[PDB]
Amino acid sequence: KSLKILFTALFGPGHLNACLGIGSLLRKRGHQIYFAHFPRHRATIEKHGFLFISLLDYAEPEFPIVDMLPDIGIIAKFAFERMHKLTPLELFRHASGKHTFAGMVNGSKGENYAMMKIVKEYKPDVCLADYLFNMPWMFTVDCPVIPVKSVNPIELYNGPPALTGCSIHDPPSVREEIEQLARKSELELESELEKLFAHFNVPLVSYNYAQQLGIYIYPGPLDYKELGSPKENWVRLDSSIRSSNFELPEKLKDKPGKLIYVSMGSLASAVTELLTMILTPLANSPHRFIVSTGPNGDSIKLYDNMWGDKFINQVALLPKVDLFITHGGSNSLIEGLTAGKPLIAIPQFGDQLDNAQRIADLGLGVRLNLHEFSGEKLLKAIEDVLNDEKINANVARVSEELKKSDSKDKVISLIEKLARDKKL
Numbered sequence: 208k209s210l211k212i213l214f215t216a217l218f219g220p221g222h223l224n225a226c227l228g229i230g231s232l233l234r235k236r237g238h239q240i241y242f243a244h245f246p247r248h249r250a251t252i253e254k255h256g257f258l259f260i261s262l263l264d265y266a267e268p269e270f271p272i273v274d275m276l277p278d279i280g281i282i283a284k285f286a287f288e289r290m291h292k293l294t295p296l297e298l299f300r301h302a303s304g305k306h307t308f309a310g311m312v313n314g315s316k317g318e319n320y321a322m323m324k325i326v327k328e329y330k331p332d333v334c335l336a337d338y339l340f341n342m343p344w345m346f347t348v349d350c351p352v353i354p355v356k357s358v359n360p361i362e363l364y365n366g367p368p369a370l371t372g373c374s375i376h377d378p379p380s381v382r383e384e385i386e387q388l389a390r391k392s393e394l395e396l397e398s399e400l401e402k403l404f405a406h407f408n409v410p411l412v413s414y415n416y417a418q419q420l421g422i423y424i425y426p427g428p429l430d431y432k433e434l435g436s437p438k439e440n441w442v443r444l445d446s447s448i449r450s451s452n453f454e455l456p457e458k459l460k461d462k463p464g465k466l467i468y469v470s471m472g473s474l475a476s477a478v479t480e481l482l483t484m485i486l487t488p489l490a491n492s493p494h495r496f497i498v499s500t501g502p503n504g505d506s507i508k509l510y511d512n513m514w515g516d517k518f519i520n521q522v523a524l525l526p527k528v529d530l531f532i533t534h535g536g537s538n539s540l541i542e543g544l545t546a547g548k549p550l551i552a553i554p555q556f557g558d559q560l561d562n563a564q565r566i567a568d569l570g571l572g573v574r575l576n577l578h579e580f581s582g583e584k585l586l587k588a589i590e591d592v593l594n595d596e597k598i599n600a601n602v603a604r605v606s607e608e609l610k611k612s613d614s615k616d617k618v619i620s621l622i623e624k625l626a627r628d629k630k631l
């Protein structure tokens with residue numbers, strides 16, 4: 208029996224891209240996939256064979272729906288300026304118990320109204336949604352809803368607080384304070400969600416509760432097995448890659464060195480100062496760089512050893528590079544490791560700090576922090592990682608694991624079962 212499956216996600220292309228991958232698996236099984244998201248992604252969604260639904264067409268008049276990607280960058284400038292000078296601890300101190308994505312909770316009412324209307328009209332058998340936190344509609348619509356998580360999944364475990372970037376090597380005395388601050392700001396997230404749920408008259412749940420089934424996308428070899436098991440009803444999908452041939456810019460043909468990809472993500476690349484800071488020293492690195500220059504890419508200066516465009520084909524490119532300098536977004540991490548490339552992660556915000564530290568902790572690359580950044584340090588990191596026989600072997604081992612994953616079969620079966628039975 209072929210199902211009607213409805214997806215949605217946050218604005219961020221990181222979240223959209225994770226769901227595209229799951230959607231593709233379900234489409235292959237014979238299901239009709241709908242995806243409710245913003246008009247800028249209609250092409251990718253429809254190219255995947257999914258029916259596009261504009262959340263903008265379902266908005267209530269008193270509660271409009273910004274697609275925030277254009278507004279982000281204005282926000283991200285402030286974030287960059289703080290972390291570039293403050294240590295993570297000082298950042299948490301300066302935050303004064305303000306949570307990372309709490310300010311986003313209030314603004315989510317409009318998207319909630321839209322989803323209630325969409326689900327009522329389209330009457331799917333099941334929904335999947337990739338958000339930073341649970342939303343009231345997920346508990347009021349008349350079908351099972353599965354949260355999809357693509358951020359670092361330490362939040363699903365009972366060990367160190369998420370978003371702090373703690374290392375397995377940090378001793379008790381060092382984490383005590385950052386863990387107090389993290390726990391304090393978690394209370395702000397709860398109080399913000401209380402207001403949102405109260406608005407819609409829905410009983411409050413944990414921000415990462417999965418009623419029946421939740422799917423987190425993270426490579427099994429990097430998952431937090433040393434913390435036991437994730438929260439109830441959460442199941443791991445080892446990767447989610449949406450899924451062709453790529454040709455190398457002639458600029459970089461017959462230049463010396465390895466090929467290195469630089470991308471600071473979809474969100475953070477908006478901030479031109481960040482890329483400028485990073486690329487400046489790389490002019491003197493004896494290698495060839497392909498750069499994702501972001502929305503404001505045209506005014507970024509590139510050197511003789513660099514070719515860039517606003518938006519690059521990351522999945523096509525990665526097999527052809529030797530190293531990936533990344534902000535440490537989850538998707539980028541999964542794509543880089545699938546391709547078997549080592550990582551230099553320069554975390555900017557949120558879960559990236561957790562991913563960056565996990566890369567370091569498991570010998571898959573190095574973390575560099577903004578606050579102590581130097582061109583000397585970066586160039587050395589490049590040479591070190593390129594010639595570190597241990598890191599490359601670890602990456603090759605994880606790369607092999609990721610390719611042979613059969614997590615998809617189990618997860619699909621669960622999705623199908625839940626849709627049909629309405630329970631378990």
Ligand SMILES: O=c1ccn([C@@H]2O[C@H](COP(=O)(O)OP(=O)(O)O)[C@@H](O)[C@H]2O)c(=O)[nH]1
Nearest residue numbers: 221472473474499518519521536537538539
């Ligand atoms: O030039 C670019 C920049 C980004 N991406 C894609 O954008 C997503 C970025 O997600 P991630 O979690 O790594 O970063 P974030 O979006 O959270 O900044 C991934 O699917 C990348 O493949 C891409 O295809 N080309």
Ligand SMILES: O=c1c(O)c(-c2ccc(O)c(O)c2)oc2cc(O)cc(O)c12
Nearest residue numbers: 217219275279282307308309310311557
């Ligand atoms: O505080 C905010 C925040 O943390 C994030 C965020 C964090 C991590 C992510 O991975 C992500 O996609 C978004 O977005 C925002 C977007 C806004 O318009 C306003 C905000 O205040 C935030």
